[PDB]
Amino acid sequence: WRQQWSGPGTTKRFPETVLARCVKYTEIHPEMRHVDCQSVWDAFKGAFISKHPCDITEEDYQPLMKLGTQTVPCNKILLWSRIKDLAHQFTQVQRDMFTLEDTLLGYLADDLTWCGEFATSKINYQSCPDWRKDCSNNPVSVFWKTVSRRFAEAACDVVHVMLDGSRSKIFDKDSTFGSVQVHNLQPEKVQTLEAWVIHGSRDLCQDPTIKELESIISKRNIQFSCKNIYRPDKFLQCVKN
Ligand SMILES: *[C@H]1O[C@H](COP(=O)(O)OP(=O)(O)OC[C@H]2O[C@@H](n3cnc4c(N)ncnc43)[C@H](OP(=O)(O)O)[C@@H]2O)[C@@H](O)[C@H]1O
Ligand SMILES: Cc1cc(NCc2c(C)cccc2C)c2cccc(C(N)=O)c2n1
Numbered sequence: 001w002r003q004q005w006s007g008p009g010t011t012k013r014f015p016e017t018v019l020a021r022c023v024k025y026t027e028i029h030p031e032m033r034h035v036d037c038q039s040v041w042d043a044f045k046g047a048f049i050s051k052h053p054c055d056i057t058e059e060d061y062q063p064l065m066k067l068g069t070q071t072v073p074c075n076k077i078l079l080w081s082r083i084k085d086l087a088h089q090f091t092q093v094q095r096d097m098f099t100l101e102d103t104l105l106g107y108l109a110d111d112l113t114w115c116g117e118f119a120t121s122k123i124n125y126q127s128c129p130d131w132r133k134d135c136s137n138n139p140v141s142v143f144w145k146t147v148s149r150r151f152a153e154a155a156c157d158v159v160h161v162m163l164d165g166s167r168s169k170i171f172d173k174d175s176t177f178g179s180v181q182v183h184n185l186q187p188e189k190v191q192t193l194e195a196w197v198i199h200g201s202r203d204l205c206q207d208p209t210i211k212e213l214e215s216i217i218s219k220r221n222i223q224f225s226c227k228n229i230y231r232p233d234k235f236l237q238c239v240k241n
Contacts, residue, residue, distance in 0.1 A: 003117075005053070005127035005134050010114040014123065018044060021108050032070065032104060040067050044108070047139065049116040053128060054135035056142040065146065068105040072098045074156035074189065081177040083164040083198055086232060090162070094239045097160075100151045109147075115139045148176055152184035158192045158225075159185060163210075165229075166200035171213040178213070187221045194225040198232055 011017065022037035043064040048056060078099045080087035091097045100106040115128035115138060129138040161177065163170050172178050185193065195213065197204045204210070205226035214224040229235050 002126075005115075005124075005129045007128045007130035007134065007138075008113055009126040009128050010123050011112045012125065014112060014114050015041065015045070017112065018108050022104070025104050025107050029104070035067065035104075040064065040108075043067050047143070048114065049121045049123065050119055051116060051139075052118040053115040053124070053138050056137050056139050058142060058146045061143055061146045064105070065150065068103075068108075070104050071154055072103060074154050075158070077151070077155045077159055079152070079159060079161035079177055079181055081161065081163050081172065081175055082167055083162050086198060087162045089236060090239070093236050100147060103147075103151065105147050106151075109140075109143055113140055144176065145180060148180045149184050152181040153186060155185060156189035158194055159190055160194050160196060162196050162198055164200065165197045165204045169209050170197060170204060170207050171195075171209040173209075173212065173216075178216075182213075182216055183220075185217075185220065185222060190222050192223040192225055193217050194227065196227050196229050198229045203228060 019037055019041045022035070022040050026032045026035055026037065043066075047060040047064055051060065073096075076097050078087060078091060078097050080099060084101075087099055088101065091099050091102055101110045113128055115124050116122060117124055128140065129135045131138060131141045182193075195205070195210065197207075197210070205228055210226055214226075217224045
């Protein structure tokens with residue numbers, strides 16, 4: 001008897017990857033160079049090993065959050081929903097802008113999966129809990145919830161958010177962005193949230209779910225703005241001009 005979750009297990013070579021990522025990020029971001037990447041890995045590991053993979057708390061990720069403190073310029077923030085690919089292409093071109101995944105902690109975990117088990121220091125490479133079918137307080141989900149919150153709370157001025165214009169729900173209130181990030185934007189620092197609806201033929205800023213988004217934001221005393229992005233590759237090459 002070995003317990004089986006419904007989600008894929010920890011990515012192969014996850015320890016070696018996270019550590020390699022930390023080392024590489026520090027090499028290219030000179031302002032992080034003093035960071036001890038072996039301590040960063042140990043803290044990451046410390047959050048979830050020896051714990052039941054359903055009994056994880058934000059507080060578990062505190063030692064890692066502290067070591068990975070990085071308050072990027074808050075007026076340069078890009079949020080996204082169900083359109084991670086393009087959001088990242090954008091910040092590769094508009095290199096001063098930052099997504100969560102361009103921050104050290106987000107850079108480390110992007111596209112990865114991980115979990116441990118109760119009482120032992122073993123990483124589970126065969127299965128990890130699905131957030132839907134098994135339990136929502138797993139290592140991955142709790143990680144992303146914690147860093148998202150700090151990231152969205154730090155934001156200031158005009159905050160931008162990309163949305164996928166092809167989806168049935170362009171703004172999906174049951175998602176990290178619509179349920180976590182949007183409710184963490186601070187009225188003191190944030191003047192405006194500007195949505196960028198990415199087309200994949202007509203004004204999608206009229207959409208019912210965008211109006212929902214506007215309603216949410218309006219109730220936080222934050223101004224709202226929406227812009228259609230008809231030609232994706234054309235927008236990429238028109239940001240700097
Ligand atoms: C901070 O977060 C957003 C990016 O997050 P977003 O793309 O809005 O997240 P999605 O809901 O589109 O997908 C995230 C993955 O996690 C699963 N999931 C976990 N918990 C979930 C809840 N409570 N609702 C919905 N989805 C949840 C998703 O699995 P399914 O979509 O259910 O298969 C999905 O794999 C950015 O702005 C960044 O800055
Ligand atoms: C696997 C995963 C899950 C994410 N969010 C899950 C979630 C949701 C959807 C709602 C409420 C709470 C949580 C924790 C997630 C969010 C942002 C980014 C990434 C990324 N970059 O891989 C990312 N990944």
